Design a protein around this ligand. Structure first.
Ligand SMILES: Cc1cc2nc3c(=O)[nH]c(=O)nc-3n(C[C@H](O)[C@H](O)[C@H](O)COP(=O)(O)OP(=O)(O)OC[C@H]3O[C@@H](n4cnc5c(N)ncnc54)[C@H](O)[C@@H]3O)c2cc1C
Length: 441
């Protein structure tokens, strides 16, 4: 069916985000001379989930008998990612191997962590039983709370945080230096449709009415991808919430080299950024969707993203609850920034990276499922491998096109997340006056 693939083949990548920039870089390194990346926004896109001052990176090797094929595939992805965060000149400056603490504050949450995360892992964890145990994982003055009911485990090596925003910019800069062409801005990079001829994809149409033709088209537009192809319910666009506190110029100096602290039913925080000294808190919960009528499925819903630099008041309150337990000296500080951030979950929260069975010139690379950002250095290599029909066996069948898994999908499934109301929430039920008002009157 499709044209024969070579490095002279014209390629279009839809979406210059986390995975799109990685893909552009890897295709350039592999000697693909004719690559064009389309995005409605210039890098770093304000709607990219990767456009964040930090994200968590973690890699765990799994014991024999404690893996299933899905978790083994995940460890294959993170193994490669870890190696590259420590080595690849484009990414290495942006990885901080400070460690990672996973915790919960009820016996049920703590048991879940023990069974799913700790017992299966070859990692040698340090157990944290008391408030003092938690506080001693960071410099004096940083963790001050009583951690009521908390127990957790510290993973020192092979985990930490990444400066996702700077690493994405780094990848973009290097892909463009190596000759990739970026068309970024609206309407010129805002893709509204895939373009088909003879039952295959021949490129993309942007909002200005231009048709961009290529021999292969890669769809890597994060949550926005769901509007450009019928994924047969394989994607659920879903939002999480983040806010920032501005640290002062003396107090900030203690907050350095910090392991990530994560309570699976409350949230996490990462150390203040180097440029604005802003400390980011994510309140953990199963996610917000924005459920509107599915234009192609009568009587059914489909979640549609929208951008906003505020968060619901209830999400701010959850963030402050996390701070009260951990850093109560910060819990009443004004927010300096907040936003909603969109990803898309597959039914099993494995990635979806495959050639389309009906349209072989289309490659989809979607379904970050809440753990795509840590894949940045290497995900473009896996995506390029799939383009070249050689995605490795340890991942190919896990991340395949799999519409059978999403028949009668329950959009309100909590998909192994916890916190907040312990249910999927709907932005259509959030009042207009129910948001933070940062920077307003
Ligand atoms: C709050 C939050 C915290 C997270 N924490 C972590 C973490 O700690 N570690 C981790 O690994 N992952 C984390 N994730 C998940 C991670 O951010 C995502 O899985 C990953 O960034 C997704 O990458 P992507 O390239 O698929 O999407 P994105 O990075 O969102 O990029 C998508 C791009 O597509 C572009 N686009 C959209 N519409 C179109 C269109 N019509 N035409 C062309 N281009 C388009 C966008 O402008 C954007 O640049 C988190 C996500 C959220 C929301």
């Amino acid at each position: 069916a499709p044209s024969i693939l070579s490095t002279e083949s014209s390629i279009i990548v839809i979406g210059a985000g986390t995975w799109g920039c990685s893909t552009a870089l890897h295709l350039a390194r592999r000697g693909y001379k004719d690559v064009t990346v389309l995005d409605p926004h210039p890098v770093p896109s304000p709607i990219a989930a990767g456009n964040d001052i930090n994200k968590i990176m973690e890699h765990s090797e799994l014991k024999d008998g404690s893996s299933d094929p899905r978790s083994a595939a995940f460890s294959t992805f993170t193994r490669a990612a870890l190696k590259a965060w420590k080595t690849d000149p484009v990414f290495q400056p942006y990885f901080h191997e400070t460690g990672f603490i996973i915790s919960g504050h009820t016996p049920a949450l703590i048991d879940h962590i023990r069974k799913d995360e700790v017992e299966p892992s070859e990692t040698n964890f340090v157990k944290l039983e008391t408030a003092e145990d938690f506080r001693r994982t960071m410099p004096p003055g940083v963790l001050t709370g009583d951690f009521p009911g908390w127990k957790g485990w510290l993973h020192k090596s092979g985990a930490g945080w990444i400066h996702a925003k700077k690493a994405m910019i780094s990848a973009f800069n290097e892909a463009k230096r190596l000759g990739v062409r970026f068309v970024t801005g609206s309407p010129e990079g805002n893709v509204v449709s895939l373009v088909y001829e003879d039952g295959d994809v021949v490129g993309a149409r942007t909002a200005d009415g231009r048709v961009h033709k290529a021999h292969r088209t890669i769809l890597s537009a994060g949550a926005g991808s769901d509007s450009l192809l019928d994924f047969k319910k394989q994607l659920r666009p879903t939002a999480w919430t983040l806010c920032h506190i501005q640290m002062g110029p003396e107090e900030v100096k203690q907050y350095r080299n910090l392991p990530v602290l994560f309570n699976i039913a409350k949230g996490f925080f990462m150390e203040p950024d180097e440029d604005k000294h802003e400390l980011k808190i994510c309140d953990e919960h199963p996610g917000y969707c924005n459920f509107l009528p599915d234009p192609n499925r009568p009587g059914q819903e489909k979640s549609v993203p929208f951008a906003k630099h505020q968060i619901p008041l209830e999400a701010e309150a959850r963030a402050r609850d996390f701070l009260h337990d951990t850093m109560p000296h910060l819990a009443d500080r004004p927010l300096s920034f907040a936003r909603i951030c969109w990803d898309a979950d597959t039914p099993d929260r494995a990635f979806l990276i495959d050639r389309h069975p009906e349209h072989p010139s289309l490659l989809v690379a979607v379904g970050g499922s809440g753990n795509g950002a840590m894949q940045m250095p290497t995900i473009g290599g896996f995506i390029a491998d799939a383009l070249e029909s050689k995605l490795q066996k340890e991942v190919k069948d896990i991340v395949r096109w799999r519409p059978e898994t999403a028949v009668d999908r329950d959009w309100r499934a909590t998909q192994n997340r916890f916190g907040g109301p312990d249910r999927i929430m709907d932005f259509q039920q959030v009042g207009e006056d129910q948001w933070t008002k940062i920077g307003e009157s």
